[PDB]
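Researcher: Let's try something more involved. This one mixes different molecule types, so please make sure each is placed in the same coordinate frame as the others.
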Amino acid sequence: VAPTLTARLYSLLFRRTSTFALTIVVGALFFERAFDQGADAIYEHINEGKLWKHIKHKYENK
Amino acid sequence: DPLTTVREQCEQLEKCVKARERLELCDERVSSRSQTEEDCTEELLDFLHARDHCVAHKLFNSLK
Amino acid sequence: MTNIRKSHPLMKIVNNAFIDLPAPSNISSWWNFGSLLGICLILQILTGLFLAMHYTSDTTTAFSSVTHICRDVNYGWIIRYMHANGASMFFICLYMHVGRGLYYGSYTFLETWNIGVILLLTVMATAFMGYVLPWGQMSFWGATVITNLLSAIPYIGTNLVEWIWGGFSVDKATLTRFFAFHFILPFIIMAIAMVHLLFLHETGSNNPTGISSDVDKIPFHPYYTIKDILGALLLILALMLLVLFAPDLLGDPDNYTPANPLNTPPHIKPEWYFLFAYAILRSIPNKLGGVLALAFSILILALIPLLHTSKQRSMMFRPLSQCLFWALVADLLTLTWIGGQPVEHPYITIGQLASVLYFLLILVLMPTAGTIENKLLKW
Amino acid sequence: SHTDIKVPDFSDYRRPEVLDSTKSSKESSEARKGFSYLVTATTTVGVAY
Amino acid sequence: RNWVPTAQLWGAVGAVGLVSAT
Amino acid sequence: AVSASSRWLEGIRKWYYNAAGFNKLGLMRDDTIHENDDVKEAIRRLPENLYDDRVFRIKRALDLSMRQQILPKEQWTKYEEDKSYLEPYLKEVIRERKEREEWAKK
Amino acid sequence: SDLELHPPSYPWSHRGLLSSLDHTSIRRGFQVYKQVCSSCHSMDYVAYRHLVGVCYTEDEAKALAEEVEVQDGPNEDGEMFMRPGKLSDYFPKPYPNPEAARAANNGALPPDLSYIVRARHGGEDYVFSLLTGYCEPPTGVSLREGLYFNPYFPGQAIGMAPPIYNEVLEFDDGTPATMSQVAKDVCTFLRWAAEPEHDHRKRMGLKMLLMMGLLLPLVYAMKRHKWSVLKSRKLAYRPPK
Amino acid sequence: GRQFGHLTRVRHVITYSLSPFEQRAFPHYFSKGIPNVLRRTRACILRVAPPFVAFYLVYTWGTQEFEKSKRKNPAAYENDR
Ligand code: HEC
Ligand code: HEM
Ligand code: HEM
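Model: All components are placed in one shared frame. Result:
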């Protein structure tokens, strides 16, 4: 037997609230970045070539 | 160019053809006195409304 | 006691009002509006101060200053929109709080209710001035029309209207005053809210059933803190859905047109929150009769208590009451519809009957229905 | 008299992991705390953002 | 006792919080 | 002269009774009154059985209003059983009051 | 009390919640305003700040900005000796002050286009339908020359010269200048002038929707976690009686 | 004044409750609601729904008229005559 993913997670990080906070601090960081990266991408896909990001080419450095 | 063709198509549909009859009359069925209150606007607006609803959906796939 | 944090500091004991307070178990979701009502007021304040932190209270600049807020200032655009839509939510919430007082008879809390009315009228003053702040065509003409309404008073009125404005029209003086009043009002409001809380803390909440629930109480912290938080999530979701994807939707007035003191508001009208009153007002031919019956629409609330006729402070077990209660809500809906209507026949005759209906429902229908139900139950 | 007492059937409300009339819950529940605190954890982390 | 360990994780948290947050 | 009319109110009464849902909640009319000063005293005069019983039923009913579930069709208060048990108690309470008011005119 | 055919609900590229502005359209439509419109209508809150909002470079718009200050320059603002260079200067006022304006247009006062789409009732649908809407006076009707007849003006009249006609201008790329094709680009540049924040906002809406689709379901859980105690609870009443 | 031990008197009432962790937050998510949501909505609907229905008719009619009377610019009195 092994601990369910949760139980592993539990005994490594949540027993002590100090560890529990730490976790949350670090996940708040990591999560921001993926969310933004993913979420941004998603958005930018829906308006392909509509946004300057897509269009800076025309008048840029010749 | 674009706009001008689509408009016509729009007025070529059975409901455009049908309510253009109220325009057609009024446009000439005005008497001698020319009762200014006889203004043909009402009837025109109707036509225009239906023409444009149509226009918009089709006219859009034609531009840049 | 030793080292029981809460009772140690005396100040901290005063906060256990949100933890160890006995809270009815059974309790519709219409009980979160109170808590939402208070997040609203903090939200506005915050946001507000920020807007006030880059806004100028002059005829020349006001519109410009607003316009600057939502263009060259960083995130000044949401904050402002968030502020505007905020005030729709604060009213939306407001009417939910009262609907519940009406329905479950929470207004049995004589004293707590009274302060509620006071609160309700105090937010109305604030929303009426702030709208003026930007100095848009809509704001400029509605401020004139409404304050001039006051000149209906026979002996004083006229002099009065002029003192309020601080001149013969609504130029600088007027505008600068609203800013200051808008500013401090909400701080005054917060004291009231807290006195309101104070009186309710002596008797507790009422419930759907309409029966004492001391036999069934529950610690506020464990439960209701989660409920409140969730309700706030839902609250914030509605505010941002509206702010982020439908900015002016709700803000009926499109008038982003600096106010030219000689023009035509085709159909000038308060925002949604005040249409009932407006409608109510037009229905009367005479202008003084309209103001009094404008005042009574809103003040009527202070008599509800004295109109209560039944033995069941809870409408829940009373069907005829429920039916008229709802009617008046839909009547109230109907009245708001009139608010954006042209001045004409169709809307006049409709609005007239809706005003009558509205006082009938509160003044005469419901009370009778109360007795009838009580007789049916052999009470 | 107080002995004719019986705790209600809780089967419906309880779950999988701890539903075994005749077995330990100590080697079950370890995780069952972690899942629930996992939801909290997430909630907090998202709200932080 | 357990305070050092706990004060050490509490010190960590504040740190990473500032760093990131700020 | 009420034979037809007042033998038919029982029908609206009966219709009304179950129309007001307290019926369903395990509750009884007496247990639905507004708890004011007269009612309080009245309640305070209830014998232990009578009174513990109201406490249980409101404890049952508020339980249900919390969970939004109605009691079983089998287990619902039947109009024919209208224990107006508070009425007795309530009346005097009132009766004593009115006297006390009246004695206070002059 | 004349019916207004205000109903237009123009198809658009940013009609949708996630739908964003098409700057090429913005770009196009800018030129439209500058050549076809700049003449009588202003845009006061509009700085020369298209750069990133319009895909014009800083060097691009600096230069675009510069010539507008060379010919309409700060000499119409009151910078006696000002010429090319500056970027904080706002779009040049067609006339020194309003009163004039109405004289050049004979009593009418050409509305600042900055907010037009957001100001008047009906947004870029009406603006498009006005410009593209010009039809023959109705049998029996009279018109003062300035009172051209437009099918969507409240009072059923407008003092509006040929807003936009075919081959009025030419775009860099080659976009077919059709009265309407030009209008579609003009409106757009208008939408943006009214609400600069249009794109940020809708991206934000995306992130607020996803987030909220994670917190609403989580926090509901939290709420059942705790409440469970009460909702699962069962009662039992056992009098001595 | 203390709120918790002075609210009321209760005799003879036993209550049985379990912990969150041994339990599930969402037992029959949909099989309970459906029929509960259904059952109370059907007892609401009659009491609630009506006056809103009526408002909708009034809305509909009411706007019809308006557009007629006004659009029917000839409504009041005819042209020919
Ligand atoms: C000078 C000639 C122009 C030019 C180049 C444009 N407009 Fe337009 N416009 C002009 C006048 C004198 C008026 C006043 C009309 C009146 O008071 O009857 C207008 C009006 C408008 C409107 C009408 C809105 C309203 O008042 O309800 C709009 C929407 C408008 N102007 C926009 C507009 C746009 C987008 C233009 C460029 C493509 C444009 N105008 C050109 C005079 C002039
Ligand atoms: C608390 C009750 C409040 C209500 C109901 C309220 C409501 C409003 C409304 C409806 C507007 C009009 C904005 C628009 O539509 O353009 C406004 C504007 C404004 N409010 Fe508030 N507000 C409140 C509190 C405050 C507070 C506490 C402050 C500052 C201390 C404040 C400062 C401002 C300022 C400076 C403006 C002008 C700029 C703008 O229009 O956004 N308000 N408010
Ligand atoms: C600034 C505006 C207001 C704030 C901040 C506010 C706040 C609150 C709060 C936090 C509660 C406790 C939770 C609840 O009962 O929902 C409450 C209850 C109550 N409020 Fe208000 N409220 C406001 C406006 C009003 C108004 C306008 C009224 C009536 C006119 C009112 C009447 C009541 C009543 C009767 C109760 C108690 C009902 C009960 O729970 O039995 N409140 N209020």
